[PDB]
Design a protein around this ligand. Structure first.
Ligand SMILES: N[C@@H](Cc1cc(I)c(Oc2cc(I)c(O)c(I)c2)c(I)c1)C(=O)O
Ligand SMILES: N[C@@H](Cc1cc(I)c(Oc2cc(I)c(O)c(I)c2)c(I)c1)C(=O)O
Ligand SMILES: N[C@@H](Cc1cc(I)c(Oc2cc(I)c(O)c(I)c2)c(I)c1)C(=O)O
Ligand SMILES: N[C@@H](Cc1cc(I)c(Oc2cc(I)c(O)c(I)c2)c(I)c1)C(=O)O
Length: 553
């Protein structure tokens, strides 16, 4: 039996949580109650299989079981086509209601009146809005979410204790989702081979002292864990994630010094911990890379006898000595290395042909460096809000066909690079910036994939996982774009508009700015400020009031 094996390892609590998440991700539109029913049914059925390893239907596969239940065009089919159906029907932007939170004491009352149905509610909502959310990590946020309500609903003030914590979680939860969406995207659209180079390059940075073989073993287990979680096999994903966490801590000494504090904590915590660990200290005198990848006379021989192992060696060796290069950059270097060998090892005298492969890197290393230097200087010179606005105008012209809400969302997140990275030293800026930029653009890419409207976004998105950022950066203002005429329905007055927060106000104003740019693409930074300021003054006066709606009329 498979259901039992899992129930035993994950324990009932997690098992119920994971199954609930699994369904909420497969059916983002079904009510909360209905899902619980399906869970409990599945949960009981497994307990029998825990007692009777030979009971009825315990020989099934998690997919068939979960499949059948969810079925009480996709269902009219069978395993595995039937599963690939639900996976293929996951929505990255469901038409689901805005997730607002009632009055503090309101939530607090229900957190007590029923603590379980409260958490399942959380997991339910989060899973359904982020159909790819890393299940194991969700269990982490769930416990931290719980901790909040148990400590904050029992204090002098609550909306000063709780809320602040509910803010940080939503944010951290939004980054975790985006971060995991890129991993799923990498596996699916580009294959695991692509994901393996990625994890190899990154773990080698985190763990410079680990010998290549250890990094391989970790990349392997890691690829398995993420494949499962991205494929909807949550129960096994969690189980495998825990085994991996256990392996890491045991061999901790041959991996990284930073794992010490991580390893001493409860399962959920140390897994999250291991995932966020700082790079270990890099070893001192490491032989020059050239010696074995350029000067050696067996380069071409090793490339043929074992390309996969050799290129891996290359990535591993280059990454471990470059914690200052973004993962995507190291992959571009890896790729150039491969291209230069593929051609060189056929020509007359290979050694001469690829003797200058490092020279071809310089160009690829500086392009990222400069861009990061410029927008950090710009950042300081404008502040986050002003900074996002400049990106907003820049990107709106590159891809004017993209819908307003998306452009605002994406631009804002691209704008956060500035505050999130620039406060770091050059040495740590590029990996922070470029790897973060890659996550945001994946958002653009996945949202855009639903209802495509720009072949320029499509090309940059599907052409190469590694060049996306440079691809978007290179884009010139789209001239084939025809000015979007004035609607006005966009600015229909609404009472809320006058009692908004700073966050809210900036968002409307950025929405207004995109519409402005989509309307007059040939505008100047100067005349855009003019139209904005006047319109900002207009809304400010009309909010002064009297018969407001008459004012905005
Ligand atoms: N900035 C990147 C770099 C990074 C990627 C991976 I791949 C990784 O290996 C794990 C191991 C476990 I265990 C997890 O639960 C997860 I998620 C990732 C680690 I460490 C760091 C990121 O954090 O995505
Ligand atoms: N006034 C500067 C010009 C400049 C404007 C922007 I807006 C900017 O920000 C981005 C961020 C990303 I991410 C991109 O892909 C691109 I293209 C531009 C940067 I850096 C520089 C000068 O003349 O030096
Ligand atoms: N139609 C929306 C409400 C809405 C009204 C206005 I008037 C508006 O336009 C601006 C322009 C600037 I410039 C501002 O600083 C601000 I605040 C609002 C926007 I965007 C939205 C609804 O019904 O939901
Ligand atoms: N008389 C014009 C109509 C017109 C109305 C507005 I109100 C306006 O100003 C803004 C300000 C912002 I801020 C926007 O995002 C947008 I779209 C338009 C402009 I320019 C033109 C005609 O019919 O030709």
């Amino acid at each position: 039996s498979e259901v039992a094996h899992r129930f035993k390892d994950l324990g009932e609590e997690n098992f119920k949580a994971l199954v609930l998440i699994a369904f909420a991700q497969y059916l983002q539109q079904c009510p909360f109650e209905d899902h619980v029913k399906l869970v409990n049914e599945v949960t009981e059925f497994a307990k029998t299989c825990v007692a009777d390893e030979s009971a009825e239907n315990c020989d099934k596969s998690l997919h068939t079981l979960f499949g059948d239940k969810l079925c009480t065009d996709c269902c009219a089919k069978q395993e595995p086509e039937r599963n690939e159906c639900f996976l293929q029907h996951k929505d990255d932007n469901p038409n689901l209601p805005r997730l607002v939170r009632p009055e503090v004491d309101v939530m607090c009352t229900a957190f007590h009146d029923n603590e379980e149905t409260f958490l399942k509610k959380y997991l339910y909502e989060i899973a359904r809005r982020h159909p790819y959310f890393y299940a194991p990590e969700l269990l982490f946020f769930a416990k931290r979410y719980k901790a909040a309500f148990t400590e904050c609903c029992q204090a002098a003030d609550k909306a000063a204790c709780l809320l602040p914590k509910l803010d940080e979680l939503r944010d951290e939860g939004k980054a975790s989702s985006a971060k995991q969406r890129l991993k799923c995207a990498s596996l699916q659209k580009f294959g695991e081979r692509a994901f393996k180079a990625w994890a190899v390059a990154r773990l080698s940075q985190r763990f410079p002292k680990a010998e290549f073989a250890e990094v391989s073993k970790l990349v392997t287990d890691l690829t398995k864990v993420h494949t499962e979680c991205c494929h909807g096999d949550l129960l096994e994903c969690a189980d495998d994630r825990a085994d991996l966490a256990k392996y890491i801590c045991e061999n901790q000494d041959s991996i990284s010094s930073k794992l010490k504090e991580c390893c001493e904590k409860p399962l959920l915590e140390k897994s999250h911990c291991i995932a966020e660990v700082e790079n270990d200290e890099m070893p001192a005198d490491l032989p020059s890379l050239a010696a074995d990848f350029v000067e050696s006379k067996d380069v071409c021989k090793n490339y043929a006898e074992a390309k996969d192992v050799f290129l891996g060696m290359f990535l591993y060796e280059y990454a471990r000595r470059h914690p200052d290069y973004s993962v995507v950059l190291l992959l571009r270097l890896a790729k150039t290395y491969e291209t230069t060998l593929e051609k060189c090892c056929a020509a007359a005298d290979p050694h001469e042909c690829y003797a200058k492969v490092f020279d071809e890197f310089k160009p690829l290393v500086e392009e990222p460096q400069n861009l990061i230097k410029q927008n950090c200087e710009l950042f300081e010179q404008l502040g986050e809000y002003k900074f996002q606005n400049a990106l907003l105008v820049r990107y709106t012209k590159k891809v004017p066909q993209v819908s307003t809400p998306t452009l605002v969302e994406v631009s804002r997140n691209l704008g956060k690079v500035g505050s999130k990275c620039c406060k770091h030293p050059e040495a740590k800026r590029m990996p922070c910036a470029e790897d973060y930029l890659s996550v945001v653009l994946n958002q653009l890419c996945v949202l855009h994939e639903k209802t495509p409207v720009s072949d320029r976004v499509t090309k940059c998105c599907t052409e190469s996982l590694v060049n996306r950022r440079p691809c978007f950066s290179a884009l010139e203002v789209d001239e084939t774009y025809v000015p979007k005429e004035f609607n006005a329905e966009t600015f229909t007055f609404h009472a809320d508009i006058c009692t908004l927060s700073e966050k809210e106000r900036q968002i409307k104003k950025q929405t207004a700015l995109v519409e402005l740019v989509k309307h007059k693409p040939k505008a100047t930074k100067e005349q855009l400020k003019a139209v904005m300021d006047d319109f900002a003054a207009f809304v400010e006066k009309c909010c002064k009031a009297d018969d407001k709606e008459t004012c905005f009329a």
